[PDB]
UniProtKB/Swiss-Prot annotation:
<comment type="function">
    <text>The pyruvate dehydrogenase complex catalyzes the overall conversion of pyruvate to acetyl-CoA and CO(2). It contains multiple copies of three enzymatic components: pyruvate dehydrogenase (E1), dihydrolipoamide acetyltransferase (E2) and lipoamide dehydrogenase (E3).</text>
</comment>
<feature type="domain" description="Lipoyl-binding">
    <location>
        <begin position="1"/>
        <end position="76"/>
    </location>
</feature>
<comment type="similarity">
    <text>Belongs to the 2-oxoacid dehydrogenase family.</text>
</comment>
<feature type="modified residue" description="N6-lipoyllysine">
    <location>
        <position position="42"/>
    </location>
</feature>
<protein>
    <recommendedName>
        <fullName>Dihydrolipoyllysine-residue acetyltransferase component of pyruvate dehydrogenase complex</fullName>
    </recommendedName>
</protein>
<comment type="subunit">
    <text>Forms a 60-polypeptide structural core with icosahedral symmetry.</text>
</comment>
Length: 80
């Protein structure tokens, strides 16, 4: 599907301080939307779309922190 982190859980940033989100789970996303607004060491940034598809589920939205290993949200992109 499209996960949130890779096999990383290593050095640098093994988490996700999801401060804010832009979408809600269950929608149809485009090929120009946002995802979350996450903070780290010095940056407060984004994940834009590489692809559009559904936004199946979001397990941990914002407010809480997520790791890697764990998923967050997933994307369906039937052909990528």
């Amino acid at each position: 599907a499209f996960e949130f982190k890779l096999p990383d859980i290593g050095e640098g940033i093994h988490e996700g301080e999801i401060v804010k989100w832009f979408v809600k789970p269950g929608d149809e996303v485009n090929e120009d939307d946002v995802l979350c607004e996450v903070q780290n060491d010095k940056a407060v940034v984004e994940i834009p779309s590489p692809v559009k598809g559904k936004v199946l589920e979001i397990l941990v939205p914002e407010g809480t922190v997520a790791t890697v290993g764990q998923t967050l949200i997933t994307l369906d992109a039937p052909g990528y």
